[PDB]
Each structure stands twice: as C-alpha cells, then as structure tokens.
C-alpha cells in the first residue's frame, strides 16, 4: 500500500492528527497502513481504526440515504422522468460504500481477528465485523442479501457469546455490541421484539452491576445505557 514506507508509530501519530483535523479519509488510510504492518493493535489503536472508518462510512451512508430517497420519489406515480442520473449517482455512492466496507472486512479477516485472543480485542473486532456486514446489508438487494444478513448475525452472535462469558455486564464494549446487535434485529432482521428484548435485558443487567464501578467507569457505562434507553423509548 501507499503507507508501506511510513513507520508504524508515525502512522498512528498522523491518524491522531487527522482526527483532530477531522480528516477521516486520511485517518482511515493511516490506520489501514498501521494494521498492514502486521502487529496486533492496542486498545487505543483499535479505537482509532474504528473511529476512522465509522466516520468515513457514516458520511457515505448519509449520502446514500439522501440519494435513495430522491430515487424513490422519482419512481412514484406522477413523477416526471429525470433520466438515469439519480440511479447512476446513487449506484456510484453505493459502490464506494461497499468498497470501504470490503476494505474493513478484509483487514479484520487478514489478519486482525485470527490473532485476537483476549476478549477485549476479539469482541471488538467481531462487533466491527457485524457492523460492516450490517452496512452492506443496508444497501443489499440481490442474490446475496440473505447471506450478508447472516454474515452480520453470525459475527454479532459470536461476539455476544464471548462477551457474556468473559466480560461484566457493564463493560462498554459489551454494551455497545448489544446496542448495535439490537439495532441489527430492529432495522435489518425484521425482529423488533428480539431488538426490544435484547435492549431491555442488557440495560437491566448493566443497572444491577453499576454498584461495582468507579466514578469514571460508571460514567462510561451509563452513557451507553442511555443509548439503549433511547432506543427502547423509540421502539415502545
């Protein structure tokens, strides 16, 4: 890659600079180069990788939704024919989004996940794998939409199994995994009851474990519990 000649430490340093400059494409390229050095990632480095690509794909998903909405309006009764442009441009953004998701999934598969032995790293990467298959599922329509959905489910499920065995119920990675898996159930899998049940059980079991936490860990956990509560308020 284009980052093969830069030191690992310099790539990490520049990824942090790019975050401060809100240059998330750069940040993602720097962290991709850091991953491709072949060494495992620290807790902080995993967060940098995640933050970079979440911002990049977040912009693409927002644009895809704008364009998909315009496209759907143009294909309604009484709509004037505007030509292939809206579809073409939505396809362009969609293709770029799928390329980013494939890049992240390729990093996880080569070889972040297979070298991740600790629960903190393994659950983190498997949650990522579920997230980026979920983003692929959001735009999928063809022969493989069901397989993409099952790939997301399978990664989330393995992460859930490990987190329930190896992490306390207030662990922020465990909480964010359950939050996103519940969003998967609601938005992707057409299982709103499973989404609500998971969010409720996750919230209640975290609530009962808060007494064990320091002030700073309490703040971390209750922040994500509020996101679970926000979704439950929207879903019920």
């Amino acid at each position: 890659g284009a980052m093969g000649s830069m030191e690992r430490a310099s790539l990490i340093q520049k990824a942090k600079l790019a975050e401060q400059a809100e240059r998330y494409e750069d940040m993602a390229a720097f962290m991709k180069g850091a991953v491709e050095k072949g060494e495992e990632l620290s807790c902080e480095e995993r967060n940098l990788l995640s933050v970079a690509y979440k911002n990049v794909v977040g912009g693409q998903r927002a644009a895809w939704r704008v364009l998909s909405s315009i496209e759907q309006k143009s294909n309604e009764e009484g709509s004037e024919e505007k030509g292939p442009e809206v579809r073409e441009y939505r396809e362009k953004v969609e293709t770029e989004l799928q390329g980013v998701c494939d890049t992240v999934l390729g990093l996880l598969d080569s070889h972040l996940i297979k070298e991740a032995g600790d629960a903190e790293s393994r659950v983190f990467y498997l949650k990522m794998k579920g997230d980026y298959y979920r983003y692929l599922a959001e735009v999928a329509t063809g022969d493989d939409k069901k397989r993409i959905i099952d790939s997301a489910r399978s990664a989330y499920q393995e992460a859930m199994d490990i987190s329930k065995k190896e992490m306390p119920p207030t662990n922020p990675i465990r909480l964010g995994l359950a939050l996103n898996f519940s969003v998967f159930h609601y938005e992707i899998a057409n299982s709103p009851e499973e989404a609500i049940s998971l969010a409720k059980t996750t919230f209640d079991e975290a609530m009962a474990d808060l007494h064990t936490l320091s002030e700073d860990s309490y703040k971390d956990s209750t922040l994500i519990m509020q996101l679970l509560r926000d979704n439950l308020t929207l879903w019920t």
Binding site: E19, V51, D131, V183, E187, L227, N231
Partner: peptide, 9 residues
C-alpha cells in the same frame, strides 16, 4: 434507532 455513534475517540 441509534447505533453506537463511535465517531470520536
């Protein structure tokens, strides 16, 4: 429905 925002380290 909100997933983890996860856009700030």
């Amino acid at each position: 429905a909100g997933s983890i925002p996860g856009r700030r380290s």
